[PDB]
Design a binder for this molecule. Structure first.
Ligand SMILES: [Ca+2]
Ligand SMILES: [Ca+2]
Length: 279
């Protein structure tokens, strides 16, 4: 299948070179996989989700996304027009309030929730979690991410938007998960993206168009935007049977576009997520 006039980041992960505008993908489109979006929530009634999204847990007074971040990033995972894996099932877990903030104790509880809730869901091709959040280093937050990964969930996390070494941020600095940096449409590291030896992969992160609350759309930038491209790609590749939750991050790094990015400091991987699609 091919989506013409696609958002640049979708086209970028289906191409060996920048500057294309078609997103090529296998029709299976992540069907049978499930992706938890752990964020501000999901506006599940947005037409772009086609009924494939639902809120399963909130830690505040409502389940509604009053912010937009969670709806945006879920749309990059699996909305019809803006998503990588267009037939996946999306579950929302609201660990951030409508101002986009959350306590570490709540974030940890949300990850432990996913590790157990997945056992109650029908996800025959596997389970992914997308965490576009982060803050200062916390061994307790890292441990919670490691637990989620160990339980059988492919965990993708943002490297952070500080233009610094990701070793000082959590859960980015936890080695056992998939830590995602951000790139722009000209194959430069996004000027805000963290770096360091703990990064596993880069994905598109500058000027990412996706769903927004109020049934709308908008374009925003961050490593928070890059992470759902990798989460969607993992769900897409697990549905195809090419990899599992335990090895998906390694498989994506193995099959990435290598050496394409500019302004990558020595010691950081030069790997850009790529779906290797051949019609
Ligand atoms: Ca290339
Ligand atoms: Ca890693």
């Amino acid at each position: 299948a091919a989506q013409t006039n696609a958002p640049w980041g979708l086209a970028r992960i289906s191409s060996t070179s920048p500057g294309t505008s078609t997103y090529y993908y296998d029709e299976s489109a992540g069907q049978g996989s499930c992706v938890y979006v752990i964020d501000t929530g999901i506006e599940a009634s947005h037409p772009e989700f086609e009924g494939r999204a639902q809120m399963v847990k909130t830690y505040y007074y409502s389940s509604r996304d009053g912010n937009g971040h969670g709806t945006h990033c879920a749309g990059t995972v699996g909305s019809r027009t803006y998503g990588v894996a267009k037939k996946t099932q999306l579950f929302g877990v609201k660990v951030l309030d409508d101002n986009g903030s959350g306590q570490y104790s709540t974030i940890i509880a949300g990850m432990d929730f996913v590790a157990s809730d997945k056992n109650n869901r029908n996800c025959p091709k596997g389970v992914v979690a997308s965490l576009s959040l982060g803050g200062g280093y916390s061994s307790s937050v890292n441990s919670a991410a490691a637990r989620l990964q160990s339980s059988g969930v492919m965990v993708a996390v943002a490297a952070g938007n500080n233009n610094a070494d990701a070793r000082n941020y959590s859960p980015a600095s936890e080695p056992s998960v998939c830590t995602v940096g951000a790139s722009d449409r000209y194959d430069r590291r996004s000027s805000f993206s963290n770096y360091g030896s703990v990064l596993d992969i880069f994905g598109p992160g500058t000027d990412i168009l996706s769903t927004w609350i109020g049934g709308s759309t908008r374009s925003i930038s961050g490593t928070s935007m890059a992470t759902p491209h990798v989460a969607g790609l993992a769900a897409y590749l697990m549905t195809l049977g090419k990899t599992t939750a335990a090895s998906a991050c390694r498989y994506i790094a193995d099959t990435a576009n290598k050496g394409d990015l500019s302004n990558i400091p020595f010691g950081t991987v030069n790997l850009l997520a790529y779906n290797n699609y051949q019609a």
